[PDB]
């Protein structure tokens, strides 16, 4: 399949080169997989989600996304126009309030919620969780992310936006999950992107067009935007049978574009997520 005039990041993850505008992907499009977006919620009624999104948990007085951030991330995972995996099932877990923040105790509970809740959902091709969130280092937050991964979920987490070593941030620093840095359309490391030995992969994160609340769209930037590119890619590859939840991060690293990015410090992987779709 080919989607012309796609957001640059979709075009980038199916290309061996920057500077193109068509997204190419196998039409299976993540069908039969599930992606949890652990964030401010998802505006499920948005037509872009086509009935494939649903809120399953909140820790606040409402499950509504009153911010937009979670809706944007979910759109990059799985919206029809702005999504990597255009047929996946999306599940929203609202651990972040409408100001975009959450207590670590709530975020931990949300991760353990996903590890159990997947047993209530039909995901024959596998389960992914996208965590565009984080703060300072916490062994408890990292151990929750490790449990979620161990339970059979492909966990993708944002590296963080501190232009610093991700070793000092959580869940970014948990070794066993897939820690995602951000790049721009000219294949630079995004100026704010964290780096370091714990990074597994980079994805598009500067000037990313996706869904927003009120049935809208907007472009924003962050490692929060790179993470759902990788989560959606994992779901897509798991539907194709190329990999599994336990192995998808390594598979994505193995098959990534190598050496394309600039300003990667020594000791950090130079790897940009790529679907290797070859019609």
Catalytic residues: 39, 69, 224
Q: Which is nearer to Ca ion, 15 or 138 (CB)?
A: 138
Q: How far is the CB of 199 from Ca ion (least distance, A)?
A: 8
Cα(50)–Cα(52) distance, integer angstroms: 5
Burial class, 7, CB count within 10 angstroms (exposed 0-12 / middle 13-18 / buried 19+): buried
| Cβ 132 vs Cβ 73: under 8 Å | yes
Which of residues 165 and 200 has its CB atom nearest to Ca ion in the complex?
Answer: 200
Rg of the chain (C-alpha set): 16
Dihedral through CA 103, CA 109, CA 111, CA 113, nearest 10? Answer: -150
Q: Tell me how far, at minimum, the Cβ of 179 lies from Ca ion, in Å.
A: 5
Tell me how far, at minimum, the Cβ of 207 lies from Ca ion, in Å: 26
Contacting positions for Ca ion (CB under 5 A): 200
- d(CA 211, CA 228) in angstroms, rounded, equals 13
Report the distance separating Cα 82 and Cα 74, nearest Å: 9
Cβ closest to Ca ion, residue 10 vs residue 272: 272
Residue whose CB is less far from Ca ion, 187 or 200:
200
Considering the complex, what minimum distance in angstroms separates the CB of residue 172 from Ca ion?
A: 10
Binding residues for Ca(2+) are 16, 175, 177, 200, 260
We find the least distance from the C-beta atom of residue 196 to Ca ion, in angstroms, to be 11
Nearer to Ca ion, 98 or 200 (CB): 200
From the list 203, 214, 217, the residue with the least C-alpha distance to 157 is 203
The C-alpha atoms of residue 195 and residue 217 are separated, in whole angstroms, by: 29
On whether the CB atoms of residues 203 and 272 are closer than 8 A, the answer is: yes
Closest to 94 (Cα-Cα) out of 119, 73, 118: 73
């Amino acid at each position: 399949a080919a989607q012309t005039n796609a957001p640059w990041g979709l075009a980038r993850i199916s290309s061996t080169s920057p500077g193109t505008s068509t997204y190419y992907y196998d039409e299976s499009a993540g069908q039969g997989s599930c992606v949890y977006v652990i964030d401010t919620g998802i505006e499920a009624s948005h037509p872009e989600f086509e009935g494939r999104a649903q809120m399953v948990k909140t820790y606040y007085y409402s499950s509504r996304d009153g911010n937009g951030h979670g809706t944007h991330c979910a759109g990059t995972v799985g919206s029809r126009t702005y999504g990597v995996a255009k047929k996946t099932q999306l599940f929203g877990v609202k651990v972040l309030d409408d100001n975009g923040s959450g207590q670590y105790s709530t975020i931990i509970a949300g991760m353990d919620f996903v590890a159990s809740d997947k047993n209530n959902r039909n995901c024959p091709k596998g389960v992914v969780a996208s965590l565009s969130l984080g703060g300072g280092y916490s062994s408890s937050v990292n151990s929750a992310a490790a449990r979620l991964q161990s339970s059979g979920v492909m966990v993708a987490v944002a590296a963080g936006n501190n232009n610093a070593d991700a070793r000092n941030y959580s869940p970014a620093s948990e070794p066993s999950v897939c820690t995602v840095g951000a790049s721009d359309r000219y294949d630079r490391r995004s100026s704010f992107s964290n780096y370091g030995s714990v990074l597994d992969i980079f994805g598009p994160g500067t000037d990313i067009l996706s869904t927003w609340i009120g049935g809208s769209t907007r472009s924003i930037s962050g490692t929060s935007m790179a993470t759902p590119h990788v989560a959606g890619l994992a779901a897509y590859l798991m539907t194709l049978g190329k990999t599994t939840a336990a192995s998808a991060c390594r598979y994505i690293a193995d098959t990534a574009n190598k050496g394309d990015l600039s300003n990667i410090p020594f000791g950090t992987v130079n790897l940009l997520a790529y679907n290797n779709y070859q019609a």
